[PDB]
Motif scaffolding. Structure first.
Motif, mmCIF file in Angstrom:
data_model
loop_
_atom_site.group_PDB
_atom_site.id
_atom_site.type_symbol
_atom_site.label_atom_id
_atom_site.label_comp_id
_atom_site.label_asym_id
_atom_site.label_seq_id
_atom_site.Cartn_x
_atom_site.Cartn_y
_atom_site.Cartn_z
ATOM 1 N N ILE A 142 -58.467 -49.761 9.068
ATOM 2 C CA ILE A 142 -58.283 -51.194 9.287
ATOM 3 C C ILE A 142 -57.705 -51.456 10.673
ATOM 4 O O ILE A 142 -58.287 -52.193 11.470
ATOM 5 N N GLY A 143 -56.535 -50.892 10.963
ATOM 6 C CA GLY A 143 -55.939 -50.972 12.279
ATOM 7 C C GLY A 143 -54.928 -52.080 12.444
ATOM 8 O O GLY A 143 -54.353 -52.215 13.532
ATOM 9 N N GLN A 175 -54.411 -49.438 -2.316
ATOM 10 C CA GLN A 175 -53.210 -49.939 -1.664
ATOM 11 C C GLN A 175 -53.399 -49.861 -0.156
ATOM 12 O O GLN A 175 -54.041 -48.939 0.355
ATOM 13 N N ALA A 176 -52.857 -50.843 0.558
ATOM 14 C CA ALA A 176 -52.850 -50.796 2.013
ATOM 15 C C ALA A 176 -51.766 -49.828 2.465
ATOM 16 O O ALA A 176 -50.646 -49.853 1.947
ATOM 17 N N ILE A 177 -52.103 -48.963 3.417
ATOM 18 C CA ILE A 177 -51.184 -47.945 3.917
ATOM 19 C C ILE A 177 -50.730 -48.353 5.309
ATOM 20 O O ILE A 177 -51.560 -48.588 6.199
ATOM 21 N N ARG A 236 -48.215 -47.178 13.313
ATOM 22 C CA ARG A 236 -48.569 -48.580 13.479
ATOM 23 C C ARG A 236 -49.853 -48.681 14.291
ATOM 24 O O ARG A 236 -50.050 -47.950 15.264
ATOM 25 N N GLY A 237 -50.747 -49.574 13.866
ATOM 26 C CA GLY A 237 -52.049 -49.701 14.484
ATOM 27 C C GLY A 237 -53.120 -48.804 13.899
ATOM 28 O O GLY A 237 -54.291 -48.940 14.280
ATOM 29 N N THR A 238 -52.756 -47.872 13.012
ATOM 30 C CA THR A 238 -53.708 -47.020 12.305
ATOM 31 C C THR A 238 -53.771 -47.337 10.811
ATOM 32 O O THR A 238 -54.243 -46.508 10.023
ATOM 33 N N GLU A 239 -53.288 -48.510 10.407
ATOM 34 C CA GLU A 239 -53.227 -48.860 8.995
ATOM 35 C C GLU A 239 -54.608 -48.755 8.354
ATOM 36 O O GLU A 239 -55.634 -49.051 8.972
ATOM 37 N N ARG A 240 -54.635 -48.346 7.086
ATOM 38 C CA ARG A 240 -55.904 -47.968 6.484
ATOM 39 C C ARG A 240 -55.860 -48.179 4.978
ATOM 40 O O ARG A 240 -54.793 -48.363 4.384
ATOM 41 N N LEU A 241 -57.049 -48.169 4.374
ATOM 42 C CA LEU A 241 -57.202 -48.154 2.923
ATOM 43 C C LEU A 241 -57.620 -46.748 2.510
ATOM 44 O O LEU A 241 -58.688 -46.271 2.908
ATOM 45 N N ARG A 242 -56.789 -46.095 1.705
ATOM 46 C CA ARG A 242 -56.985 -44.698 1.332
ATOM 47 C C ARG A 242 -57.629 -44.630 -0.050
ATOM 48 O O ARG A 242 -56.979 -44.919 -1.060
ATOM 49 N N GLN A 286 -64.219 -60.466 7.990
ATOM 50 C CA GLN A 286 -64.805 -60.140 9.288
ATOM 51 C C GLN A 286 -64.059 -58.982 9.944
ATOM 52 O O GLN A 286 -63.614 -59.058 11.093
ATOM 53 N N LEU A 287 -63.919 -57.895 9.187
ATOM 54 C CA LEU A 287 -63.196 -56.723 9.643
ATOM 55 C C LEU A 287 -64.105 -55.822 10.479
ATOM 56 O O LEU A 287 -65.322 -55.804 10.281
#
Ligand SMILES: Cc1ncc(COP(=O)(O)O)c(C=O)c1O
Ligand SMILES: Cc1ncc(COP(=O)(O)O)c(C=O)c1O
Ligand SMILES: [K+]
Lengths: 476, 479
Positions: free
Chosen positions: A357-358, A379-381, A388-394, A421-422
């Protein structure tokens, strides 16, 4: 005079987490043993499909695990009622430690409350007893290893992730006689990358270092018997020998990779469907931890039924390679579908499907839409778990995530990306890419994925595992 | 250290020579035959007298029923961390029940109280580098480790010596952040902290209080909320589940309300495994958000939490568990007193039997289990000072007088077989730890005669079957 403003400090620190959007809202998720992988939210009428659990083989609900729990409870009750030294040492503990030692083909294994505690205890003791120790640590090591290394209170060098050229240059900078520890993981779970365990063992031999290997995200999932990536390194030698130590490794050498690693830690709380942690090592190292580690000594032993459940899961998964081929095939199904749709999966040769996601806020919104609109729980990680800035869905497929369920997930994630609109793969490329969005080939090869349970040595089915003296202390 | 095996061998050998090397005993406790257990063989049965299953609730039908039912619905493992797939109704109910027990805004559950103590103390020092910690010399290993990990200035004060504590607190400006870390009940000799006076000192000198009630929860106060609750016994009994408007002296706040952080275990009285801290919701959210030992580990199995919840709820409204334990402890203490068996005096539930030598204590323990089928572990260095070695006996509601009589006669026989010193022998040498000391005044029991006469009908009806609402802070506070 006036006192220190403790609440003001707490408020400011929590407020910072709210500002950077790392403040966390936990989701009420009640997993249904009879409807895996479904769970219900606050109300039982609100069911969702769990796609981010670390119950990797679905064994937390396996009938043999639950039966072991029920029977052990009837006999032992709930709590152990003491510590290992006082009233908390028992047959379920002895059987569990012996099974873990057998799984990794080590002289012994020691069970802790958790792998967090095991990592902290092992790493802490190594540095407290060897003050000249130099620890060499992979930059992506888990928080429990970072904490343990800090507690070790010794000199440390962080090497860039999986960068073995830098590692060697750091090792070269010391005499061989200086005690050293190389601490790393087999599978790094947030992006799913894998360490080259054999090369690290080679570096450890050359420069005189012990190896500490965290296989929390590989036990149950790699090797013919689920003993981890270290076992996968000599896959055919271990498959041929089954429960026994092979005479030679896959390259014709004397010692297998798993044999060469000095300390292997794992969890009982993921593939093995329970709670707890352990280290597998020589009986001298095990006795050392047993005798000196305060996080082992001064805490209540885990409930007997919890240990019995983990034992049943370990024994079952050892002789069911179809759990692993099934998990891998489902992960590959999801990965292929996402690749065709431009869903930005961080490329990895493992069982993990992290979707980049980012942005922390956008990741939360995507997770919220998935659960509320599509009844999909991922869950959002965010920080501190990932940078920070590497947030992702695992996303973590299991043997229970069949293609019919995967199709629903795929369409749901596709829809959420459109609604918000990701950025897709091509959009990350337009920005220069991130975290790989050269791909390593899957750890599980086509040939390995075609194996069945009939291809395992019969000696891993219902083996009689003798208890270990070191679990109780070694008489001289 | 290039020779790693030699170093390991050398350090293990030292423990063998100083005889601190431990041999664990295979003890399998029988839920249907409490307090019996069997050894390696099921036919080889002993009576367990050293368990910390203080109220015998590890086998209580409501605890086991809660486990069985939760297992069938949820399975075994939680399957994740609190952030990822491991947050659920059993967790929410357990934290809410614990907050309710201590009448605090919130509570946070950890893998163990060792982990909880380490996590809380570590974070306090990490985030306040100017913090000064004042620690009782007899604090548990988990508190010593946590304070070390806090990496701040510390003062160790002589055990329960509040004159020294005050002198230490006085040596700083009030504005310096401070933490007073102590236990309510110290398990090895059973002594008790004066929680109220420490709270008075904390107010005066600007300190937070950190209180470990591991050996008190379930056992003290009308509802088992600990010694802090016992400090305002009648105010809490009258109000039941509710916070009282005033304390037992008519003041504004009870002692339990004034303590900033209370830690406990689920692995002793509450018959399960786990640990917790109970505190203001801001402190709980702080630990929840920052403590790596909370964040980065698998949540405890739902059935383990459900079992602990059942034990907490049952024990809250069964004060007869506490009066029963105390009467059994007093029964053993009285008999040993008449026989000259040297119990270290203490106003608590613990019956430490003074030996005075490590090898003789181990030998007494070995004879008790092998000859008399009585299991009592010998307590030696480092847990206690050399020369103070002892046998730790812990009666429960399940240790009836018939079982106590067997214990009493067995210990008497072992003392005779080994020639162990009696009270009068300690009296001749000047006494030790209050045993045989001239002019020594024993602290009166925490449980008074009047309190021991209370029954479950003397509790407020609102502690039976309370509806305990879940706490927002367990999931994160939306603003
Ligand atoms: C005073 C005290 N605090 C904390 C602990 C740790 O409790 P737990 O077994 O839940 O880790 C103990 C247990 O021995 C203890 O005695
Ligand atoms: C790589 C790694 N090591 C250790 C741990 C700790 O495992 P446990 O849940 O048993 O404490 C984790 C769990 O998230 C992990 O990911
Ligand atoms: K009052």
């Amino acid at each position: 005079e006036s006192g220190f403003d403790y609440e003001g400090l707490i408020d400011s620190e929590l407020q910072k987490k709210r500002l950077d959007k790392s403040y966390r809202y936990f989701n009420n998720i009640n997993r249904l043993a009879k409807e895996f992988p479904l769970a219900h939210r606050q109300r039982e009428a609100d069911k969702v499909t769990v796609w981010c659990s670390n119950d990797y083989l679905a064994l937390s609900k396996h009938p043999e695990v639950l039966d072991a729990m029920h029977k052990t409870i009837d006999k032992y009750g709930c709590g152990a009622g003491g510590t290992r030294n006082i009233a908390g040492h028992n047959i379920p503990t002895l059987n569990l430690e012996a099974e873990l030692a057998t799984l990794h083909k080590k002289e012994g294994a020691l069970v802790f409350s958790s792998c967090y505690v095991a990592n902290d205890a092992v790493l802490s003791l190594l540095g407290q007893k060897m003050k000249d120790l130099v620890i060499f640590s992979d930059e992506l090591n888990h928080a429990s290893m970072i904490v343990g290394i800090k507690h070790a209170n010794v000199k440390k060098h962080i090497f860039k992730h999986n960068d073995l050229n830098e590692l060697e240059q750091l090792l070269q900078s010391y005499p061989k006689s200086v005690p050293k520890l190389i601490a790393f993981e087999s599978v790094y779970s947030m992006a799913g990358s894998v360490a080259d365990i054999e090369k690290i063992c080679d570096l450890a031999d050359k420069y005189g270092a012990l190896t500490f290997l965290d296989e929390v995200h590989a036990v149950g999932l790699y090797g013919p018997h689920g003993a981890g990536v270290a076992e996968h390194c000599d896959f055919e030698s271990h498959r041929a020998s089954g429960i026994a130590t092979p005479k030679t490794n896959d390259k014709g050498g004397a010692k297998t990779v798993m044999d060469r690693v000095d300390m292997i830690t794992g969890t009982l709380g993921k593939s093995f469907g329970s709670v707890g942690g352990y280290v597998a090592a020589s009986r001298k190292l095990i006795d050392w931890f047993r005798s000196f580690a305060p996080g082992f000594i001064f805490t209540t032993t885990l409930p007997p039924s919890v240990m019995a459940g983990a034992t049943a899961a370990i024994r079952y998964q050892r002789c069911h390679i179809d759990l692993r081929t099934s998990q891998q095939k489902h992960t590959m199904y999801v990965k292929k579908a996402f690749h065709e749709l431009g869903i930005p999966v961080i490329p990895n040769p493992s069982h993990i499907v992290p979707v980049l996601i980012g942005n922390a806020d956008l990741a939360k919104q995507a997770s919220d839409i998935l659960i509320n609109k599509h009844q999909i729980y991922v869950q959002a990680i965010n920080f501190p778990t990932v940078a920070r800035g590497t947030e992702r869905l695992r996303i973590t497929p299991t043997p229970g995530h069949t293609n019919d369920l995967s199709d629903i997930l795929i369409n749901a994630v596709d829809d959420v990306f459109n609604e918000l609109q990701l950025p897709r793969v091509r959009d990350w490329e337009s920005q220069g890419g991130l975290l790989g969005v050269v791909e390593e080939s899957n750890l599980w090869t086509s040939s390995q994925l075609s194996l069945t349970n009939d291809d395992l040595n019969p000696n891993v089915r219902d083996p009689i595992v003798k208890q270990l003296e070191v679990s109780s202390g070694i008489k001289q």
